[PDB]
Amino acid sequence: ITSVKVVTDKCTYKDNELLTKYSYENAVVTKTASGRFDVTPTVQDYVFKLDLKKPEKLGIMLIGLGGNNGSTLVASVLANKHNVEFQTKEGVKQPNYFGSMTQCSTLKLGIDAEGNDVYAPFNSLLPMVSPNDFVVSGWDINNADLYEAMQRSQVLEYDLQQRLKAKMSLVKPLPSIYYPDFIAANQDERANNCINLDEKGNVTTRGKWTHLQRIRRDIQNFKEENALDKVIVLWTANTERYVEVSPGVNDTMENLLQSIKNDHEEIAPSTIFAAASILEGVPYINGSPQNTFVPGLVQLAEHEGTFIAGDDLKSGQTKLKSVLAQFLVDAGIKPVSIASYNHLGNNDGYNLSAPKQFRSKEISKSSVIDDIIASNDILYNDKLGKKVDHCIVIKYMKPVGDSKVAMDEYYSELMLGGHNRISIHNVCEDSLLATPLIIDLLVMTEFCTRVSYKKVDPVKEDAGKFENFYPVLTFLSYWLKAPLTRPGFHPVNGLNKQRTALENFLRLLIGLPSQNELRFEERLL
Amino acid sequence: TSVKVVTDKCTYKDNELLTKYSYENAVVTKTASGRFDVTPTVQDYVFKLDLKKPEKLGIMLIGLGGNNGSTLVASVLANKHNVEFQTKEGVKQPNYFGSMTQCSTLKLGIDAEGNDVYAPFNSLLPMVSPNDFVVSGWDINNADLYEAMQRSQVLEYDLQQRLKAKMSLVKPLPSIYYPDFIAANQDERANNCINLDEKGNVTTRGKWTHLQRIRRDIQNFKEENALDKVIVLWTANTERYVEVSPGVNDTMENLLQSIKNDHEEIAPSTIFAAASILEGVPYINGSPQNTFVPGLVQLAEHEGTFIAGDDLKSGQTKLKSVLAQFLVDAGIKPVSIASYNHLGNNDGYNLSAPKQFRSKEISKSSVIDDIIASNDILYNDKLGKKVDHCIVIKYMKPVGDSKVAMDEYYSELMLGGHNRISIHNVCEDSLLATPLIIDLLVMTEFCTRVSYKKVKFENFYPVLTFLSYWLKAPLTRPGFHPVNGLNKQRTALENFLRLLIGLPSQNELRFEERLL
Amino acid sequence: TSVKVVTDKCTYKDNELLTKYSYENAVVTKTASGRFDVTPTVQDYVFKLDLKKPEKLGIMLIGLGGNNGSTLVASVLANKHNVEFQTKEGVKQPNYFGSMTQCSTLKLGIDAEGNDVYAPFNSLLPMVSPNDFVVSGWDINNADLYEAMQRSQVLEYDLQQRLKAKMSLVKPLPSIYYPDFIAANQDERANNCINLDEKGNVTTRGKWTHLQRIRRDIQNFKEENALDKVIVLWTANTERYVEVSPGVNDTMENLLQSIKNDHEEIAPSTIFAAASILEGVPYINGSPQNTFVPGLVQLAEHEGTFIAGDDLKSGQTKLKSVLAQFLVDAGIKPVSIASYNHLGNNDGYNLSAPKQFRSKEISKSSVIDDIIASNDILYNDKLGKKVDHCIVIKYMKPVGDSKVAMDEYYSELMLGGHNRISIHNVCEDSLLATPLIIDLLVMTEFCTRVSYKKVKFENFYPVLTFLSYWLKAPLTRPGFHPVNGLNKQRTALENFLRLLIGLPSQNELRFEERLL
């Protein structure tokens, strides 16, 4: 077991609790007509409290448990927890969590006697739950057990599936809520495990409040059946179409709850799952692009004080885009055309073949560069043009299966009429890329539930009381395509900035300042 | 555009900015039990920035008549005189796209809504504009810069014609040509050399006299143009490496004596670097040869003059310093990185020779070493700690200056999976490199106006590692390992500019949004 | 499936097919005035096809324990015994996909509607099935074929396990290992050699005795398995070239004497080819070394035994023999063709050495020479008659047998335009090569049953150029230039099979549709 111990008077320990002092500095800016930027530095001191006692087991409930990602997630936990080595044509392989930033990345803690960097595991600075301690269950409109799910997904090595057969065969998804109009029509045949059935045993959208109550109870039941104290819910089911947001329906917490009781057509299954989780005080993460978090739902989360986050896992093509586009603009290069094509042959692609479902994904993938473009008016302005042509395409091509093929072209302008053209072919084994990110989201969300803080009054010791994070956990942005935000705030999509935020947060909790890369030990005499 | 920070850390006195800064870091030790003991450190400083920048900055390029050299002069003239030009896409206005100092922005803070407010990179503190560069230099070929532009085939025909009158006036000074240091196929190109014998033939004898002539050229350039500040940058053919031998080029004293002795380990770049250091003018190496031997670093340390470089990081390697870092930071394990390149300009022609290619193979290959050493979860004895990496550069005349980079990043994912990223990158080499040369010059000049003291003012340690963002193989201070990640390199520069104006490091914590 | 043509050109007599054929061609001369004078020629023949094919065909592979050798045996066993196997995509049935003789079709004519009717390539005339191959061979490494499969990492794990019992029974015969002909890194792999001295150390002395042993191995293989027909194919490490010297390997007589003299220009492949020719068994070279020196071609001509080869044309080069031809046939002018490759199998490991790589550089580079020489409108002194072409092969262990080919075809269009085709081709080398080895064996056996006479029957000229479709650098008859275009190579085979059954050449005129 690796650990970190910082010698600092900013941190004090007491009864499994870590209390850390931190001075947060930032600055407010105004721009004069003359083109002058007036910068006024701001400061706010805090005391962060971290409950060091992490749960021995963490309950995980996945909506879409029997899908490619859901089944692969369960397989990865079982394989790593029980060290299930498996056979491949390249020999015996040992399970690992590669692709997971929380489990397989490192962070610089400082320098050695020679002035060179010393790194430690991301999850070694402070106590975090291990995916090996995840107790997983969930719902799926299809009743196939998880062994059948692995067979169906065609994601994992045959021998590994066989070694996991006995255990996975026993994991069966709980019945779920299936409202036909929210996902592709071609999914009809797949639905045979539903709770919303009428007297004649037929799927119905009537009684949405009852469906909501069933989900809340499902959570309570799962918790007690596993003698668990903490649970997190994550949506990893078919991408739904967007719902319309209209006054009097889902614009406020009050209207939202009433609309559910009224079986309103703007209430999707994800809307119900999110509402149920929020009401149970269980963090809810949206791994898909539909606009689940309508204003009325955000309001509900704010009122209940329950964490919510998400909107589409940022796993491959978009993850790279949030790195490349940022790099080009940061370098003073001007992207003017970004074409992104994708073809895959799994059920995700099958569902996305329907225009309404595709639309949701089109928006999340296209929006990732908006803030980057708006950050540079030297390159993007009225005189030179402030637009970047951007197209997103997703086609269902059964033969490639889960190995989604992303083909992109980044065409940029250089000085004096020149250009730079970067063409990419990226083979994305979607579930293997996504599963570790789902793991990261769960690990980081749990960590955040143990953090509280209070503003410090410079002239009054121990003033105010501890509070939890604002409900929308933007700290999870690294893993999501279209970061949900607090009203009024714009999202920041740059991958490196998103990781830096997490890095500096873990650092401040153990008494360390932000990474500055100034390296004065080397640059100054 | 300007920036004014309300802070008591900064005080202005006689066109001089004095800024207080507390530098924090931490020293780490790891125990056998796997425990990291971190001890924070702190050191207060007072930085002084001479706000009086030169109205005109002298630039002397070695390899002035080459693709990059001629494009540099054209870019300065085109932008300075607003030379719009015709293209099949219509009339275009000149700009400095591709330049990080001229065309990128930095976040200064947030607005009343809590959202980011950005300002130009060169607006936080006064920096010299490339429009005010006065350029001269050397080249073993005497073609004037208009003829050089024609030869390079880099710029739009109409732009070349509109710049003809002005570019025809610029002619490279003769240089030092030691045949064995560059490709043999460059012989017919050399017709502008100072190192000639009684019969008028190129000679490697009299290297000290060659050094004195370069010093004279620098002195004359300053006097002719009434310039007080000059910077020299090597943008000439990539040279083969020289051997570092005890008693030859290991010390400042031995180095100078070796030059006087016409030692075979003294390359033309060695002489240009020595001459620049002796004239007190910063010297930047835009090529991969190991110009900065120990004796030269010593000389720079002794004279207190800036040196930096070793290969412009412009295209394939720049992207690699971003992608490889991204993958490892994400917990993904690259295991194979194949990088191929073909180009048809003189750079490629020179690089077609083994000894010259070798220099470039090293700079492009080393960019990921630090990244791989930073993660022992992925890279260790049990799982393997190596990343197969190959660098290939082939001369293919038809593509000209538009170098084609083809790469494949093959990485391991969990449970036996893989990720394969294949790339085809068309790099208009000179248009990518020119703005970087500009950045290096602008940033170097800025650094010469910075001094500091712990709390007598002193200048930066001679090796300007702050310029790493623009170089493939960052030269480092003895004992120190280079850091190649592009984003970290830009972050270093960003936080430096920020602290000079009293702002702390960017932290991205955004507590205004994340906390109640 | 079978084919029966109603024709008076064919007559059957004692399991023998006799076919009349009038071969037309034309001789051309060009005048200074630019006039092409064409004189048609005609020669009637009577071809005889022995319809009695062997029930079992002996196959002896040099390099039997390698990636291709072990995959070949696995493919034969899997298909012969219908060994279905599990994969993450479900149960799959074995097949010979990638084999032109087993899985491609040929147009026999049109139906009543005037539309094409196709039949299997191997259904026009009786050909041996790979299912009836009896395989043995040699390898400098003694691992049995199951262990060889494990080592190669080519086949699905479950298939390997289902074939374990049968593959474990196959073990390569010891071979001839002359260290200087292949990469030095192959030393530790050699533990199965016949050429050992008194101390039991590998030796290059006694080459004639090595030759006699190979002949014995062939004779024994035939006797042990009661086989009357055997074919030998080289699928071992690529060797470096040998020098062709007068008095050494220029003639049949000098060649044999050089072997007896243990001459340094006698490679292991030279000995295997000589031994095969002397035993009257066809010999196919699946590698690029220049095995067929003049003296060996002479020997084959004298003995009247078939020889062919020089590098399997399986992936990057196969596609090139299609794309380069397509562009030039279209009036488009390729000016730059860059071809890069990286792989991590033993083939790549061996090719990492310069001398071995050189052999492959030549075979892959020559495939476009004839194409470029065929069009003097595009390629001439005024416009330039060269196409820059580079071939690169790098060893990158992580990709294993899945070789990655990255190419760029840059061509000129009218009025200064260009076309740029960039490709990333993942080549599972053994799965691409194995069916080609099968095709070469099937087609070679077929050719041994063909004789003809102008109108005593004679066999084909020793060098079987009809096999060019499967080889990169077609060996040719003295004075004759090779033709590398894939489509023309398949057309040659197609029309040969057609004429044997009384059908004329495919003409694609389709007058049934084009004319009233």
Ligand SMILES: NC(=O)C1=CN([C@@H]2O[C@H](COP(=O)(O)OP(=O)(O)OC[C@H]3O[C@@H](n4cnc5c(N)ncnc54)[C@H](O)[C@@H]3O)[C@@H](O)[C@H]2O)C=CC1
């Ligand atoms: N795999 C990746 O790399 C990425 C995936 N995503 C999203 O994650 C989601 C899951 O992807 P996959 O596992 O590949 O898809 P999938 O189609 O294999 O699995 C989704 C599962 O959800 C179940 N389902 C559908 N509606 C449901 C409901 N109302 N309640 C309960 N179960 C329901 C389906 O029966 C299916 O088993 C999709 O929305 C996809 O767009 C987002 C970004 C990246």
Ligand SMILES: NC(=O)C1=CN([C@@H]2O[C@H](COP(=O)(O)OP(=O)(O)OC[C@H]3O[C@@H](n4cnc5c(N)ncnc54)[C@H](O)[C@@H]3O)[C@@H](O)[C@H]2O)C=CC1
């Ligand atoms: N363009 C790019 O993107 C990058 C270029 N570089 C390097 O920058 C250098 C310049 O590149 P290009 O302008 O394309 O090449 P180039 O060959 O067109 O120009 C170099 C010039 O140097 C001159 N020269 C050679 N030896 C000399 C000497 N001893 N003294 C004075 N002049 C001399 C040559 O006559 C030529 O005009 C090369 O070493 C190249 O490898 C490094 C990284 C990237």
Ligand SMILES: NC(=O)C1=CN([C@@H]2O[C@H](COP(=O)(O)OP(=O)(O)OC[C@H]3O[C@@H](n4cnc5c(N)ncnc54)[C@H](O)[C@@H]3O)[C@@H](O)[C@H]2O)C=CC1
């Ligand atoms: N796989 C492909 O797509 C193509 C392969 N080739 C050539 O086919 C050959 C075989 O390829 P692989 O099976 O992949 O290589 P490999 O290295 O796996 O197999 C070659 C085998 O030859 C054996 N060997 C070496 N020298 C020998 C000797 N003197 N006598 C007997 N055995 C000897 C080695 O021990 C090894 O098992 C190579 O020369 C390769 O360049 C040519 C064109 C395409």
